[PDB]
Every structure is written in C-alpha cells, then in structure tokens.
C-alpha cells in the first residue's frame, strides 16, 4: 500500500527496488516492500535506508526471504520449503553485478550452481550428482561453451570435424587448454602446446606453428596467425565473437 506519494524508492543490487515508508507505523518501524519474480515481499525495519529483511510465500507454499545489507551493497534471496528452514535456493548479489546462485537437495547438498561475473559472463553447473559430476556451460559474450563438470575438473569442448578443443578448469580454477585431432594423416594433423605463463595455446600443423589462441583474463579469446614458415606472428590478433570463428580456427 506504498505509493509514490507516501514512500521512497531505493535501487538495490540485482536490479531490484524497495519502497520504504516515509512515516513509521506504530511500533516505530518503517515498512518495506520489494517485488521479485512476481511476489511482493514485505518486512519492517528500524532504518529507513532500504536495508532489512523481507519475506513472502509462493503459490507452491515455499517461503521466500530477502536480506538487504545495511550498506545496500549486497542482497541475499533465499527460498525454503514450507517449514521455513530447509533451503531450496539461495542467491547472493553484489553492487558490482556479480552474483552466485545455488540449488540444494534433500540432504543440503548443492545440485546446481550459477556463477555470474561482473562483466556478465557466467559459469553454469546443472544436474550435479553426489559423485560430483554434472553438466557444465560457460556463457561468454557471443557464444556458449558446453561441457561437463567432474570431481576433478570442469571441461568445455568445441568440435570442428576431427579436431576437439577442450577448456579445462581445475578445482583451484586456473584454465588449461588441450587439443586433440582424430585425423591420422601426419601432413594435416593439428597438435597444440599450452603455455600457462601466458595462457596461450599454440597450434601446429606439419611441424609449423599456425595460430595462437590466447585465453584472456577478461574471459575472451583472441586468434592470431603465424607467417607461412611458422616462425613469427603476423599483424594483429582478432577477438573471437562467435562460435563459428572458434570452429574456423580449428579447421
């Protein structure tokens, strides 16, 4: 029942807004309301900054709770079962647009994890099983790399004909890239060497280096060709924008 006339709107992380009563109700507390995913969460607080705890109930009987940091710099959005205690889902979002969302099963184990970085790229882990495996997906600007997660690593894979390029992610989180060619003709088989110090994969064909693929700290990929003798690199390095272009680079 808060309007433009009797409240103020406060911007929050996660592209949300809270309305805050200008006047305290009896109890000397400010009323708060915030809309998320079609439900109006309500709460009260002693501050009128827009921080506090708001709650609701979904049509499926789940209980929802939104906590806004005192700083308005971090929100936490949780979904519980009917009992208000068993966790179904939790999402933490910061002012920098970074966020982390997870889903849990009966035993409290993580069954899905979405990681969103500040730039907007994401790592998406779905169908996680008790053995630690599940489907994996990294969402970049212009394309999506699909693969699998396992207790040892995350592996994303791109295929063009006989050539498979794999982006590995350890549990520590430093990337490692390999390439394997099914083509068994020594004249056209592509091989690759990985330098961790520079995050570069060098592709060789017929014992001559042909391209450099740089996997940058900004979650982008660049490609640059060697000259026809495989000794020095040529011209400028192009930033990859489409899945097609990664496939061209593997042809």
């Amino acid at each position, epitope marked *: 029942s808060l309007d433009e006339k009797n409240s103020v709107s406060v911007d929050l992380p996660g592209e949300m807004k809270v309305l805050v009563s200008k006047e305290k109700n009896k109890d000397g507390k400010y009323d708060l309301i915030a809309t998320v995913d079609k439900l109006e969460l309500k709460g009260t607080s002693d501050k009128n900054n827009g921080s506090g*705890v708001l709650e609701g109930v979904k049509a499926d009987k789940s209980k929802v*709770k939104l906590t806004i940091s005192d700083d308005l710099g971090q929100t936490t959005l949780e979904v519980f079962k009917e009992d*208000g*205690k*068993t*966790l179904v889902s*939790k999402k933490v979002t910061s002012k920098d647009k970074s966020s982390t969302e*997870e889903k*849990f099963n*009966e*035993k*409290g*184990e*993580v069954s899905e994890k979405i990681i969103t970085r500040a730039d907007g790229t994401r790592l998406e882990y779905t169908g996680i099983k008790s053995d630690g495996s599940g489907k994996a997906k990294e969402v970049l600007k212009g394309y999506v790399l699909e693969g699998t997660l396992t207790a040892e690593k995350t592996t994303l894979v791109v295929k063009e004909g006989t050539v498979t390029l794999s982006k590995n992610i350890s549990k520590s989180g430093e990337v490692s890239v390999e390439l394997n060619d099914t083509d068994s003709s020594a004249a056209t088989k592509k091989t690759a060497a990985w330098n961790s110090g520079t995050s570069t994969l060098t592709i060789t064909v017929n014992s001559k280096k042909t391209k450099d693929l740089v996997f940058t700290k900004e979650n982008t990929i660049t490609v640059q060709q060697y000259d026809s003798n495989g000794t020095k690199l040529e011209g400028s390095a192009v930033e990859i924008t489409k899945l097609d272009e990664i496939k061209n680079a593997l042809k």
Partner: antibody, heavy 122, light 108 residues
Framework: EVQLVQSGEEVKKPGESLKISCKGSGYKFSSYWIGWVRQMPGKGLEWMGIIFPGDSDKRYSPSFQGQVTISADKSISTVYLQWSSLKASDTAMYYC???????????????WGQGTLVTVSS | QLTQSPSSLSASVGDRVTITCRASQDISSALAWYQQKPGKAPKLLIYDVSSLESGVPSRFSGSGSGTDFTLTISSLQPEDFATYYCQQFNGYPHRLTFGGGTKVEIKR
C-alpha cells in the same frame, strides 16, 4: 506434530553394551538429518553424530568417531545410538535431535527428544 | 572457537537483556541460539543469526556480523529465566560447537 520419543532411563555397569533409540513422528522421517547430543552432569552440550535415515549416510563428530555407532531403521522411523563397552564417564543425558543443514552455510537442531538418562557405575 | 561472555547474568522481569557470543574466526551466518531449563531438553530460539523459530515469542531477537553475535530479549518474562547456548557450524568436515552457556537469573 513433530515429535521425537526416546527410549527410557538406563542404569548399567561398566563394560556392558547398550543401544538406545529415538522414534520420530509428524514428518517424513527418512528425509531429514537426525543426530545425537551428549550432556554430562552439570556440563554443556556436545554433538556426537548425525545420520540421514533415507540412505544411512553418517557424519560423526571427531572425538566421538570410533567410540559409538549410530544407525537407523527407516521402516519404523527409529534412529539408534550404541556402545560396545560403556565406561563410567559415559554417564550423561543423551538427546536425539533433528538436524537442519545446508552445504557449508548452516547446521543446527530444530527439534529435540526428551532425553535419555544413562547411568554407568560399578 | 566459541566464547559466550556474560556466563551469568542477573535481571528483572521487564528488563532488556543481551547475551554475546564471540567466534575465533568468521562464521558468516552459521550460528544458532538455544534455551534450556533444568531437567528439560534444549529448545531452538534463533537460527541463521537472526531468524526466529516458529512459535518463539517476538521479544527474542538475534544479530551479529563476522565473529560477534548477540541475543537480545526485549522485556524479560518469568518463563525466560533459564540457560542460553549459542552454537556454530563448520562444513569441511561436519562440526558443531556449542558455547559454554549463559544462566539468566532473577535479580534481587
């Protein structure tokens, strides 16, 4: 309705075996962690272990692992705590309690049995 | 890892009462509060630092940050004279630690 009913008072001698039980009601027993907590006379509370009745997954406190055995019988909604050879220092109140827990963020007991008093002495 | 400071606290019916719990390292929101009366089983009051359990009166409140947590009772009632325990959780591997307890007793 949630109710945990523990078995009755025990007076035993050292070196005897003992198994005490806890039966739950008013919730889906096989879908919640359930656990055991010790309170020695005049002292505080100490966690012993938890079990998931659905598949008998067990997490013991260090400092109790290898000292006791926790088990479950999903078909009668009962969890057990058992000693092979009691010692006088096992004299204590024992509580069974339902355990709410999620990944590495939280772990607490929201409902408690009434308690089982165990006396161990020559 | 968990130190409960007041240890024994004297107050009257209608008083404002604060109990503190200090953790040896940050524990985020993995803290719960219980009440226990002599002869009776513990009872959950607060979980996730500040969340009130169903059926516990509104005069109970919890708060805290990294390593400092507080349980507050607005206006003490006679059924609130009892012992209170904080309790923390750590996850790798599973570990639960209770505070030493704070007995809240009647002032005279």
């Amino acid at each position: 309705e949630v109710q945990l009913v523990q078995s009755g008072e025990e007076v035993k001698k050292p070196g005897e075996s003992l198994k005490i039980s806890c039966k739950g009601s008013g919730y889906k027993f096989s879908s919640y962690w359930i656990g055991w907590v010790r309170q020695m006379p005049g002292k505080g509370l100490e966690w012993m272990g938890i079990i998931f009745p659905g598949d008998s997954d067990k997490r013991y406190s260090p400092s109790f692992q290898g000292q006791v055995t926790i088990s479950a019988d999903k078909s009668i909604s009962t969890v057990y705590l058992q000693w092979s050879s009691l010692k006088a220092s096992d004299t204590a109140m024992y509580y069974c309690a339902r355990h709410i827990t999620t990944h590495t963020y939280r772990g607490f007991f929201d409902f408690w049995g009434q308690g089982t008093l165990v006396t161990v002495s020559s | 890892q968990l130190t409960q400071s007041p240890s024994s606290l004297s107050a009257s019916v209608g008083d404002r009462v604060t109990i503190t719990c200090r953790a040896s390292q940050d524990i985020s929101s993995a803290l719960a509060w219980y009440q226990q009366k002599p002869g009776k089983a513990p009872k959950l009051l607060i979980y996730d630092v500040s969340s009130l359990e169903s059926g516990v009166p509104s005069r109970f409140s919890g708060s805290g940050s990294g390593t400092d947590f507080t349980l507050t009772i607005s206006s003490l009632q006679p059924e609130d004279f009892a012992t209170y325990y904080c309790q923390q959780f750590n996850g790798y591997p599973h570990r639960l630690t209770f505070g030493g307890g704070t007995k809240v007793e009647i002032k005279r």
